[PDB]
Amino acid sequence: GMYKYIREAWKSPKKSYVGELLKKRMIQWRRDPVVKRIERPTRLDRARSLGYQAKQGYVVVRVRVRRGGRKRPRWKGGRKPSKMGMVKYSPKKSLQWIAEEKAARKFPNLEVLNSYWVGEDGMYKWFEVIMVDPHHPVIKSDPKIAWIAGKAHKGRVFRGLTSAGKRSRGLLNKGKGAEKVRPSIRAHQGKGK
Amino acid sequence: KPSYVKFEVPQELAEKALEAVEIARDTGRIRKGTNETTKAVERGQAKLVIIAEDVDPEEIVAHLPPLCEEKEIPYVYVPSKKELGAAAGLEVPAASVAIIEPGKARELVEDIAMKVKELMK
Amino acid sequence: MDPYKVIIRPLVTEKAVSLIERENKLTFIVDRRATKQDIKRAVEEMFNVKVAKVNTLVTMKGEKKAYVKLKPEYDASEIAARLGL
Amino acid sequence: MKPSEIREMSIEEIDKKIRELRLELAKERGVLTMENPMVIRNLRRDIARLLTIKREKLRE
RNA sequence: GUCGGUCCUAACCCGACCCGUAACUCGGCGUCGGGGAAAGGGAAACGGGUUUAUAUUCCCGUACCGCGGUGGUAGGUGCGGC
RNA sequence: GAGUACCGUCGGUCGGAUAUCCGGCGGGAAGCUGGGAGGCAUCGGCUCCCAACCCUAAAUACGUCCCGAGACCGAUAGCGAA
RNA sequence: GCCCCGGCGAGGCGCAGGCAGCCGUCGAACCGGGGAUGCCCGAAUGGGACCUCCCGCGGCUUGCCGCACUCCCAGUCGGGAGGGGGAACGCGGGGAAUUGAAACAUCUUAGUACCCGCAGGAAAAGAAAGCAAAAGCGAUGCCGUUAGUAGGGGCGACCGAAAGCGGCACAGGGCAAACUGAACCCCGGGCCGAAAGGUUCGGGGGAUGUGGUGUUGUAGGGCCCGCGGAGGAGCCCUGGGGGC
């Protein structure tokens, strides 16, 4: 037990005791910096499913991002009318992934593993990101996360191998409809997404 | 001050609870940890639940009061996890503990239960 | 620097010879990276003399050059003969 | 000079010989501006051998 | 050692943090730290002679600054003038 | 294995057409007597499968390099440079 | 240009045909292998640059070590990581116009040139909430065909797949949870051992769960029951032979 009850509390927070908790917590988070390290996860069931243990080498980092889409900058030279838009654009990455990348900038000796949603507002979204030190012996002594010390896993979040990146790349659909997403997007000339 | 706390137990009760836990550890049976405690309560083997107030996030232990109130098992609060764990016989701290098979604490648990009821009402 | 590496070369020119005769001076070519004090030591050891003054200039070939004046107890001509000239 | 000979010697004799050859090299470079054009090459490489061998000895 | 740099700040600039940006070798407020004038501010040398070619830089003669010392006095415990 | 499957709407993209994939906004589940797919939506039948966590060699692409070759050029040619 | 081990076996001192001279038979030059020394700038890193040069602080005995920024484990000491470079190939984002349509605006050029970021000797993908149709297949990836087809489109100019069939090559494993409950991991020092490995002391973590079990579909696993008790496939080199 103790895990399904947390899952229940968070499956709809407006209905549980979590809404007002989150109101207060945000009152205090809005003053914090954009990337902040913490002691313990807020959604422990979800963390421990995504891969998180209470050993040395795991780090939890909250990130704040702004909501909505993009506003393109204006164009200097002449354009055709199908190419003048500035406002109603949206990004092709998700805010989850953008947050992961900001954290990866701030902690350079580390590597990202996964992330989970932890709050909303009218202007901001909040994600908690998990990270792992690949040069710790406690971490090189565990076969579940000893792959991460390899020579092809640095830049993971940047090339797109985290779950958010796979989602945004299209690697959750397998048959009809996903003819253009394997083995990659460049392989098909960006013609998927 | 958190919101899973429904009432204010004083020094009296908190200290008696720590000593009851230490005595029940050294004589009877003690289930340590939120998950052990939760399962004990779900199966009915729990005769008293000690909960900590020094906890964050509250989502760890915020399910226990509204469950023990149903199963009709008494529960008290205490203000620190390090002390509770030291009592239970750990170097790490505990957020929740369950007393099963009391030995030499029976009357302590009697009084704790009565005062907890008087306080809740 | 260290003694015995400072001094590269002694000079033999008409100006240097004039100074040897008149002023009791020696004229050396030295490693750029040495200072007046290191030059002083170097001369003292490599020749067992007491020195009075050192003056330096970097040339238009990339060479540091030292005019060295000894105390009137000693004599330049002596060491100039001890060397070749 | 031959490493066989140099290896029969002590660290202080080696230091002394290095100083001596340094001085002889200076005075030869001096008189050069004013026969046997190889004195300089040979002395340089002598000092080189001496330094290498002293470093070996100290590393043992 | 004494000429000038080297020191001080000016208009101005950079770095780190911070906020933004899909991102940056891009953009920027504030805090902190640092740079920025061989005609601004600013310890101290003048005459004669010497060389094919340097000299307030070398030689003679007469001097001055800054650090550290040795030895004596002023003073600590002294006066003159409405 | 939940702000997930799914539903509407906006922008982009695709051969993807009332039937591609990505993202923003507003709503939002069941959870083993369970759940998904079967080219408009829905009802029934049948067939196939169990998402929202992770690792993984071989067959492949390249040639700032090497070996080795040539119905290639032969000093205004051949690489810009014998 | 200095040293050592080997090969070759008499001359040698770069392109580069000179004067004068030295090295070598105690085995050179040359070739293969391994070591030493290695100025300043530069990621450039103790702090600064109108000139690849300057200015310093601690601690030990002129000589030396240490001291950037952002981070992890610790914590009054220490131990570690990143940063820059690299033809073409690679993953992820941002994104034009000339031109064509005999003008042009949707389309085309084109997810192109170019820009930003991240990796390697290969990268990326990869073990069905799939394909299909009265029959059946069985992870990914590459070639040849399917095919200028289905299908998109001022239905104009034009754009444009897949499944399957034939072959190359082949390989499958682990978590979360349920049930147990410290039975567990790491650092440093000491004793066995040739080593792979095993045993004690002091610290760091871990009850907000370390270790064990467990992993899937006309279901699988756990708890309960009975019966049975082939994890024995792999690690090392004091050894003895072989091939390259």
mmCIF file of N, CA and C in Angstrom, chain A residues 22-115:
data_model
loop_
_atom_site.group_PDB
_atom_site.id
_atom_site.type_symbol
_atom_site.label_atom_id
_atom_site.label_comp_id
_atom_site.label_asym_id
_atom_site.label_seq_id
_atom_site.Cartn_x
_atom_site.Cartn_y
_atom_site.Cartn_z
ATOM 1 N N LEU A 22 -1.505 22.557 -3.527
ATOM 2 C CA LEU A 22 -0.780 23.059 -4.683
ATOM 3 C C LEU A 22 -0.877 24.570 -4.784
ATOM 4 N N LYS A 23 -2.022 25.135 -4.420
ATOM 5 C CA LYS A 23 -2.135 26.586 -4.352
ATOM 6 C C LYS A 23 -1.033 27.180 -3.482
ATOM 7 N N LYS A 24 -0.918 26.690 -2.247
ATOM 8 C CA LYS A 24 0.106 27.208 -1.343
ATOM 9 C C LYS A 24 1.514 26.941 -1.876
ATOM 10 N N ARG A 25 1.763 25.709 -2.309
ATOM 11 C CA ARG A 25 3.083 25.353 -2.796
ATOM 12 C C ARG A 25 3.516 26.269 -3.922
ATOM 13 N N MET A 26 2.615 26.567 -4.857
ATOM 14 C CA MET A 26 2.935 27.499 -5.927
ATOM 15 C C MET A 26 3.173 28.900 -5.395
ATOM 16 N N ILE A 27 2.375 29.336 -4.417
ATOM 17 C CA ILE A 27 2.639 30.641 -3.822
ATOM 18 C C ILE A 27 4.106 30.740 -3.468
ATOM 19 N N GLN A 28 4.684 29.627 -3.045
ATOM 20 C CA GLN A 28 6.078 29.661 -2.627
ATOM 21 C C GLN A 28 7.053 29.346 -3.753
ATOM 22 N N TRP A 29 6.625 28.573 -4.745
ATOM 23 C CA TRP A 29 7.489 28.219 -5.861
ATOM 24 C C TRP A 29 7.728 29.389 -6.797
ATOM 25 N N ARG A 30 6.738 30.264 -6.965
ATOM 26 C CA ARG A 30 6.878 31.384 -7.887
ATOM 27 C C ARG A 30 8.041 32.292 -7.530
ATOM 28 N N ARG A 31 8.478 32.277 -6.278
ATOM 29 C CA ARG A 31 9.620 33.060 -5.837
ATOM 30 C C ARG A 31 10.940 32.330 -5.992
ATOM 31 N N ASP A 32 10.910 31.028 -6.188
ATOM 32 C CA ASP A 32 12.118 30.244 -6.318
ATOM 33 C C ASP A 32 12.732 30.436 -7.694
ATOM 34 N N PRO A 33 13.992 30.056 -7.862
ATOM 35 C CA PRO A 33 14.599 30.097 -9.192
ATOM 36 C C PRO A 33 13.985 29.065 -10.124
ATOM 37 N N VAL A 34 14.388 29.159 -11.391
ATOM 38 C CA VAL A 34 13.756 28.375 -12.445
ATOM 39 C C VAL A 34 14.114 26.906 -12.328
ATOM 40 N N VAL A 35 15.339 26.610 -11.904
ATOM 41 C CA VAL A 35 15.822 25.261 -11.660
ATOM 42 C C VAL A 35 16.234 25.179 -10.199
ATOM 43 N N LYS A 36 15.625 24.258 -9.459
ATOM 44 C CA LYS A 36 15.920 24.127 -8.036
ATOM 45 C C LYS A 36 15.978 22.665 -7.629
ATOM 46 N N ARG A 37 17.053 22.289 -6.954
ATOM 47 C CA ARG A 37 17.205 20.925 -6.484
ATOM 48 C C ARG A 37 16.448 20.703 -5.184
ATOM 49 N N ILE A 38 15.931 19.486 -5.014
ATOM 50 C CA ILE A 38 15.124 19.159 -3.852
ATOM 51 C C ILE A 38 15.589 17.847 -3.241
ATOM 52 N N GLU A 39 15.066 17.577 -2.045
ATOM 53 C CA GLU A 39 15.497 16.438 -1.244
ATOM 54 C C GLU A 39 14.784 15.157 -1.642
ATOM 55 N N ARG A 40 13.510 15.254 -2.008
ATOM 56 C CA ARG A 40 12.646 14.098 -2.142
ATOM 57 C C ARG A 40 11.586 14.386 -3.183
ATOM 58 N N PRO A 41 11.167 13.382 -3.947
ATOM 59 C CA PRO A 41 10.122 13.602 -4.943
ATOM 60 C C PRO A 41 8.790 13.972 -4.318
ATOM 61 N N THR A 42 7.969 14.641 -5.122
ATOM 62 C CA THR A 42 6.616 14.983 -4.717
ATOM 63 C C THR A 42 5.618 13.904 -5.089
ATOM 64 N N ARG A 43 5.854 13.196 -6.189
ATOM 65 C CA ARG A 43 5.054 12.050 -6.602
ATOM 66 C C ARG A 43 5.950 10.820 -6.626
ATOM 67 N N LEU A 44 5.955 10.108 -5.505
ATOM 68 C CA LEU A 44 6.941 9.063 -5.278
ATOM 69 C C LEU A 44 6.587 7.781 -6.011
ATOM 70 N N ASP A 45 5.314 7.412 -6.022
ATOM 71 C CA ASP A 45 4.860 6.321 -6.872
ATOM 72 C C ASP A 45 5.339 6.501 -8.311
ATOM 73 N N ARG A 46 5.083 7.676 -8.877
ATOM 74 C CA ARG A 46 5.405 7.927 -10.271
ATOM 75 C C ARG A 46 6.906 7.915 -10.501
ATOM 76 N N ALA A 47 7.662 8.542 -9.603
ATOM 77 C CA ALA A 47 9.114 8.487 -9.685
ATOM 78 C C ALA A 47 9.618 7.051 -9.682
ATOM 79 N N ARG A 48 9.216 6.280 -8.678
ATOM 80 C CA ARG A 48 9.732 4.936 -8.517
ATOM 81 C C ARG A 48 9.332 4.037 -9.676
ATOM 82 N N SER A 49 8.226 4.341 -10.354
ATOM 83 C CA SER A 49 7.909 3.616 -11.578
ATOM 84 C C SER A 49 8.802 4.040 -12.732
ATOM 85 N N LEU A 50 9.044 5.341 -12.874
ATOM 86 C CA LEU A 50 9.911 5.843 -13.925
ATOM 87 C C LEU A 50 11.370 5.487 -13.721
ATOM 88 N N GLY A 51 11.716 4.905 -12.583
ATOM 89 C CA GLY A 51 13.089 4.577 -12.285
ATOM 90 C C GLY A 51 13.718 5.588 -11.362
ATOM 91 N N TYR A 52 13.668 5.296 -10.074
ATOM 92 C CA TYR A 52 14.235 6.153 -9.055
ATOM 93 C C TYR A 52 14.418 5.322 -7.806
ATOM 94 N N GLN A 53 15.635 5.285 -7.302
ATOM 95 C CA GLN A 53 15.942 4.614 -6.067
ATOM 96 C C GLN A 53 16.578 5.611 -5.120
ATOM 97 N N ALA A 54 16.634 5.216 -3.855
ATOM 98 C CA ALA A 54 17.099 6.055 -2.761
ATOM 99 C C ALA A 54 18.568 5.816 -2.452
ATOM 100 N N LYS A 55 19.370 5.642 -3.494
ATOM 101 C CA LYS A 55 20.803 5.458 -3.392
ATOM 102 C C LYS A 55 21.538 6.776 -3.604
ATOM 103 N N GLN A 56 22.863 6.714 -3.522
ATOM 104 C CA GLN A 56 23.707 7.838 -3.888
ATOM 105 C C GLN A 56 23.880 7.887 -5.396
ATOM 106 N N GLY A 57 23.675 9.061 -5.972
ATOM 107 C CA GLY A 57 23.817 9.255 -7.392
ATOM 108 C C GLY A 57 22.555 9.690 -8.085
ATOM 109 N N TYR A 58 21.424 9.692 -7.395
ATOM 110 C CA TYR A 58 20.163 10.168 -7.932
ATOM 111 C C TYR A 58 19.857 11.558 -7.390
ATOM 112 N N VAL A 59 19.405 12.436 -8.277
ATOM 113 C CA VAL A 59 19.160 13.840 -7.968
ATOM 114 C C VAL A 59 17.815 14.243 -8.558
ATOM 115 N N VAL A 60 17.056 15.036 -7.809
ATOM 116 C CA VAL A 60 15.728 15.480 -8.214
ATOM 117 C C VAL A 60 15.720 16.997 -8.307
ATOM 118 N N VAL A 61 15.193 17.504 -9.420
ATOM 119 C CA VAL A 61 15.320 18.901 -9.806
ATOM 120 C C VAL A 61 13.977 19.377 -10.337
ATOM 121 N N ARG A 62 13.413 20.407 -9.719
ATOM 122 C CA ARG A 62 12.204 21.037 -10.228
ATOM 123 C C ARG A 62 12.523 22.162 -11.192
ATOM 124 N N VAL A 63 11.734 22.237 -12.257
ATOM 125 C CA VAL A 63 11.894 23.223 -13.311
ATOM 126 C C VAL A 63 10.564 23.909 -13.557
ATOM 127 N N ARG A 64 10.640 25.220 -13.763
ATOM 128 C CA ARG A 64 9.519 26.075 -14.130
ATOM 129 C C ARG A 64 9.652 26.549 -15.567
ATOM 130 N N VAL A 65 8.596 26.355 -16.359
ATOM 131 C CA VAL A 65 8.542 26.854 -17.727
ATOM 132 C C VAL A 65 7.264 27.650 -17.925
ATOM 133 N N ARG A 66 7.292 28.529 -18.915
ATOM 134 C CA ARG A 66 6.135 29.323 -19.285
ATOM 135 C C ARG A 66 5.241 28.571 -20.259
ATOM 136 N N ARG A 67 3.948 28.853 -20.181
ATOM 137 C CA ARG A 67 2.958 28.134 -20.963
ATOM 138 C C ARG A 67 2.734 28.783 -22.319
ATOM 139 N N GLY A 68 1.985 28.076 -23.144
ATOM 140 C CA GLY A 68 1.659 28.518 -24.467
ATOM 141 C C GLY A 68 2.671 28.093 -25.503
ATOM 142 N N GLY A 69 2.611 28.795 -26.623
ATOM 143 C CA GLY A 69 3.459 28.517 -27.752
ATOM 144 C C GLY A 69 4.552 29.527 -28.004
ATOM 145 N N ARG A 70 4.793 29.772 -29.281
ATOM 146 C CA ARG A 70 5.879 30.597 -29.772
ATOM 147 C C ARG A 70 5.345 31.871 -30.395
ATOM 148 N N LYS A 71 6.154 32.918 -30.326
ATOM 149 C CA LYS A 71 5.974 34.098 -31.155
ATOM 150 C C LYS A 71 7.248 34.268 -31.955
ATOM 151 N N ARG A 72 7.154 34.011 -33.249
ATOM 152 C CA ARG A 72 8.282 34.181 -34.130
ATOM 153 C C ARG A 72 8.723 35.640 -34.162
ATOM 154 N N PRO A 73 10.014 35.887 -34.343
ATOM 155 C CA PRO A 73 10.469 37.241 -34.637
ATOM 156 C C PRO A 73 10.129 37.656 -36.055
ATOM 157 N N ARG A 74 10.119 38.962 -36.259
ATOM 158 C CA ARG A 74 9.738 39.482 -37.544
ATOM 159 C C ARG A 74 10.847 39.307 -38.557
ATOM 160 N N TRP A 75 10.431 39.308 -39.805
ATOM 161 C CA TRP A 75 11.274 39.034 -40.944
ATOM 162 C C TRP A 75 11.707 40.345 -41.579
ATOM 163 N N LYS A 76 12.981 40.412 -41.959
ATOM 164 C CA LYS A 76 13.531 41.627 -42.546
ATOM 165 C C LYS A 76 13.260 41.704 -44.035
ATOM 166 N N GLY A 77 13.583 40.654 -44.749
ATOM 167 C CA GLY A 77 13.378 40.617 -46.175
ATOM 168 C C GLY A 77 11.987 40.232 -46.556
ATOM 169 N N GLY A 78 11.730 40.345 -47.850
ATOM 170 C CA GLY A 78 10.405 40.095 -48.361
ATOM 171 C C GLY A 78 10.013 38.637 -48.283
ATOM 172 N N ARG A 79 8.749 38.408 -47.960
ATOM 173 C CA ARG A 79 8.193 37.079 -47.868
ATOM 174 C C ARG A 79 6.949 36.990 -48.728
ATOM 175 N N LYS A 80 6.594 35.773 -49.069
ATOM 176 C CA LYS A 80 5.290 35.499 -49.618
ATOM 177 C C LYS A 80 4.285 35.368 -48.484
ATOM 178 N N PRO A 81 2.999 35.537 -48.775
ATOM 179 C CA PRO A 81 2.013 35.633 -47.694
ATOM 180 C C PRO A 81 1.833 34.377 -46.870
ATOM 181 N N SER A 82 2.140 33.214 -47.408
ATOM 182 C CA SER A 82 2.059 31.972 -46.668
ATOM 183 C C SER A 82 3.176 31.808 -45.657
ATOM 184 N N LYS A 83 3.990 32.841 -45.455
ATOM 185 C CA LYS A 83 5.187 32.725 -44.638
ATOM 186 C C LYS A 83 5.407 33.956 -43.768
ATOM 187 N N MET A 84 4.365 34.740 -43.527
ATOM 188 C CA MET A 84 4.438 35.968 -42.763
ATOM 189 C C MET A 84 4.040 35.802 -41.307
ATOM 190 N N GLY A 85 3.412 34.689 -40.952
ATOM 191 C CA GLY A 85 2.923 34.519 -39.602
ATOM 192 C C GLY A 85 3.989 34.724 -38.546
ATOM 193 N N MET A 86 3.542 35.207 -37.388
ATOM 194 C CA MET A 86 4.424 35.539 -36.284
ATOM 195 C C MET A 86 3.919 34.995 -34.951
ATOM 196 N N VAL A 87 2.611 34.808 -34.800
ATOM 197 C CA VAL A 87 1.968 34.749 -33.480
ATOM 198 C C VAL A 87 1.508 33.337 -33.123
ATOM 199 N N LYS A 88 0.650 32.744 -33.946
ATOM 200 C CA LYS A 88 -0.077 31.534 -33.584
ATOM 201 C C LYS A 88 0.723 30.269 -33.827
ATOM 202 N N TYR A 89 2.041 30.351 -33.774
ATOM 203 C CA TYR A 89 2.881 29.177 -33.891
ATOM 204 C C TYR A 89 3.019 28.475 -32.554
ATOM 205 N N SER A 90 3.321 27.190 -32.634
ATOM 206 C CA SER A 90 3.556 26.343 -31.485
ATOM 207 C C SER A 90 4.808 25.515 -31.708
ATOM 208 N N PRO A 91 5.486 25.116 -30.639
ATOM 209 C CA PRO A 91 6.698 24.316 -30.794
ATOM 210 C C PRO A 91 6.401 22.858 -31.096
ATOM 211 N N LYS A 92 7.419 22.192 -31.625
ATOM 212 C CA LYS A 92 7.334 20.793 -31.990
ATOM 213 C C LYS A 92 7.914 19.883 -30.922
ATOM 214 N N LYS A 93 8.676 20.441 -29.992
ATOM 215 C CA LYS A 93 8.967 19.824 -28.712
ATOM 216 C C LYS A 93 7.919 20.208 -27.683
ATOM 217 N N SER A 94 7.784 19.360 -26.681
ATOM 218 C CA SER A 94 6.932 19.642 -25.547
ATOM 219 C C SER A 94 7.681 20.359 -24.427
ATOM 220 N N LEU A 95 6.893 20.997 -23.566
ATOM 221 C CA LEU A 95 7.443 21.777 -22.468
ATOM 222 C C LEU A 95 8.164 20.899 -21.459
ATOM 223 N N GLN A 96 7.705 19.664 -21.293
ATOM 224 C CA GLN A 96 8.415 18.655 -20.517
ATOM 225 C C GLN A 96 9.861 18.513 -20.964
ATOM 226 N N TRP A 97 10.058 18.341 -22.262
ATOM 227 C CA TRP A 97 11.381 18.153 -22.825
ATOM 228 C C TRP A 97 12.214 19.424 -22.718
ATOM 229 N N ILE A 98 11.593 20.572 -22.974
ATOM 230 C CA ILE A 98 12.282 21.852 -22.837
ATOM 231 C C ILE A 98 12.793 22.044 -21.409
ATOM 232 N N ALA A 99 11.971 21.691 -20.429
ATOM 233 C CA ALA A 99 12.383 21.739 -19.035
ATOM 234 C C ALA A 99 13.555 20.807 -18.738
ATOM 235 N N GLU A 100 13.439 19.540 -19.138
ATOM 236 C CA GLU A 100 14.560 18.611 -19.032
ATOM 237 C C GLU A 100 15.856 19.214 -19.556
ATOM 238 N N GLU A 101 15.802 19.864 -20.718
ATOM 239 C CA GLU A 101 17.014 20.421 -21.308
ATOM 240 C C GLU A 101 17.583 21.567 -20.479
ATOM 241 N N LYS A 102 16.724 22.418 -19.925
ATOM 242 C CA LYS A 102 17.229 23.479 -19.057
ATOM 243 C C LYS A 102 17.952 22.907 -17.840
ATOM 244 N N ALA A 103 17.364 21.888 -17.219
ATOM 245 C CA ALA A 103 18.035 21.240 -16.104
ATOM 246 C C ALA A 103 19.372 20.641 -16.520
ATOM 247 N N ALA A 104 19.429 20.052 -17.710
ATOM 248 C CA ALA A 104 20.661 19.429 -18.157
ATOM 249 C C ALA A 104 21.750 20.463 -18.380
ATOM 250 N N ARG A 105 21.370 21.661 -18.811
ATOM 251 C CA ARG A 105 22.328 22.760 -18.830
ATOM 252 C C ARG A 105 22.863 23.038 -17.435
ATOM 253 N N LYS A 106 21.970 23.148 -16.456
ATOM 254 C CA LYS A 106 22.417 23.599 -15.145
ATOM 255 C C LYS A 106 23.280 22.563 -14.435
ATOM 256 N N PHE A 107 23.065 21.276 -14.704
ATOM 257 C CA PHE A 107 23.869 20.225 -14.086
ATOM 258 C C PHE A 107 24.641 19.465 -15.155
ATOM 259 N N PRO A 108 25.898 19.815 -15.423
ATOM 260 C CA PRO A 108 26.577 19.295 -16.614
ATOM 261 C C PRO A 108 27.265 17.958 -16.431
ATOM 262 N N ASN A 109 27.575 17.605 -15.197
ATOM 263 C CA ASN A 109 28.216 16.343 -14.889
ATOM 264 C C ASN A 109 27.235 15.182 -14.792
ATOM 265 N N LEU A 110 25.970 15.396 -15.125
ATOM 266 C CA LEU A 110 24.914 14.428 -14.890
ATOM 267 C C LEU A 110 24.269 14.014 -16.206
ATOM 268 N N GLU A 111 23.285 13.129 -16.095
ATOM 269 C CA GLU A 111 22.502 12.656 -17.223
ATOM 270 C C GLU A 111 21.045 12.501 -16.810
ATOM 271 N N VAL A 112 20.145 12.892 -17.701
ATOM 272 C CA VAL A 112 18.710 12.836 -17.452
ATOM 273 C C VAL A 112 18.202 11.415 -17.649
ATOM 274 N N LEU A 113 17.206 11.042 -16.848
ATOM 275 C CA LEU A 113 16.544 9.754 -16.972
ATOM 276 C C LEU A 113 15.063 9.886 -17.307
ATOM 277 N N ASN A 114 14.307 10.690 -16.569
ATOM 278 C CA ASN A 114 12.890 10.890 -16.848
ATOM 279 C C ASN A 114 12.380 12.090 -16.053
ATOM 280 N N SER A 115 11.066 12.300 -16.088
ATOM 281 C CA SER A 115 10.436 13.525 -15.620
ATOM 282 C C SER A 115 8.944 13.289 -15.458
#
